[PDB]
Amino acid sequence: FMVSLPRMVYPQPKVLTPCRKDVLVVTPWLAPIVWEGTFNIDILNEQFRLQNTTIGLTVFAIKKYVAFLKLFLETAEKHFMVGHRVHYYVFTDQPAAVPRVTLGTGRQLSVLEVCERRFLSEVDYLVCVDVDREFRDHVGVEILTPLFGTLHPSFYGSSREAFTYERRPQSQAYIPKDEGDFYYMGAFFGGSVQEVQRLTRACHQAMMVDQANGIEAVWHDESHLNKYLLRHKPTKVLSPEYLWDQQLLGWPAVLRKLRFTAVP
Template sequence: WSWGSRSALSWPFSSGSPAVRARASCDSLQCIAACFVTQHLLHLAESPGPLVCSPSCQLTCRRVALLRCSRNDVLVLTPWLAPIVWEGTFNTDILNEQFRLRNTTIGLTRTEGGDRELFLQTAEKHFMVGHRVTYYVFTDRPAAVPRVPLGEGRRVVVLEVLGGPRWQDVSMQRMAVISRFCEQRFLREVDYLVCADVDMKFRDHVGVEILSPLFGTLHPSFYGAARKDFTYERRPRSQAHIPRDQGDFYYMGALFGGSVAEVHRLTSACHQAMAIDQANGIEAVWHDESHLNRYLLDHKPTKVLSPEYLWDQQLLGWPRVMKKLRFVAVPKNHQDIRAT
């Protein structure tokens, strides 16, 4: 039932570090490439007066220097030339106009548990504002899903699923559930799918700048860690196994997405890998997140979201490099959750 309107690398971040200055310098090829790609994709050029982006898009944009670095304190490009999205690396007005011209519809999935009302209320305030959105709420208790006032073109669809005895079971079932509903309805109903976890809320703007064929989000606890410290699954018996000399970034399972077709491929592959592990009597160390990291190592995301999009202020505070905290954890007892 539904309601609503139907209209490899790691890096340090301390600005005083010589390594950071070398990596972040505008003189580096990587930074120049990042600036070029970012500005070129936004159709910007140095010219006097307003610029019309294309004949079909009457959006005018301000004059911007073509090769000026938007951020020089963080990594803004992966080695495979995928943008890493930080505040200051995109133009919201231009992107909003481009996606409105396509009449884009975004689906947001949310697994069972946590404060659904808080999640939906904050999503209405900050998530894809001005765009068509369908919230897909997975639950084994449909009657418990609260009714939240929705904006035009936004609706909630409640999808009944079986619960699990442990949070780990619910987490791992998510891949199978998303894969199944991709086939049954998501492919027909939305253009992009954003998959979010429980116990999270939106705190600031999360918009179309995140959309891409396939995106993952950097884990906030590991964005400054060395690759050897990533908590990948290290046991070769598991389908999620990543050797110690491999790996790009460590992605968190609480926020990923892309086109529905790509999300279907990702969730189907992870579900199949978990089924093989189960048949072999092994469970990956971080469950579906371990399998997500294996998949994104083999299938590079076309966009990577910075830790602005997945942060735990209770554990990590608010470092200066984070200009905004956009999607944040609801305070909880992490030790109690991990022990259950």
């Protein structure tokens, strides 16, 4: 039902001082855009611990991608939801090649060789990411919300006409040039179990419709993700801190932390 926070001592928020003056920190549908400086982690950890929050983390690692699991899981252990209950779900064609990674207390891993309600009974939130990445800094409960997408690192400063949406009206993923909020990357999204299952259900149906019609969206599931989040606005948006490639993009001033990154 949600118990009281304990007494806590922290700096007073200042109404007449913005957290960040260099970036947009709230969407026009009033969803926070999560940048370093916008959140007090101690406050958020308390709120989420008091609810006994469990976070599921899902990765698909097929064929050569199994090689990335060791670094992925080891760095998640250092940086992902530390202090909270975590259930890793590794979807893989090579169950025996999954590295044996030492987990912290309250954390567990299931290997599933390649049923949806499993998630509803096991976790509160689902975080769906690509495996060819490593955590380099804190990725915590600040991301948790009914539905979130992450700003693609190549497009956060782009105007919408430049976004690589599906542009053919024949595709279910079609977005015209005068539409679009952001360009979300397919490599990092999540939310409540119910919201994530709704999204992935919608994108599986749209992709079949397209297959039937002999069309494949320009950026595949990412194109459909972008269509879905246009029409169903995420309740938080994560800044590109949460999906970076320092080799391709460097380290701009506007990024105070590089949290989850492409592997060198």
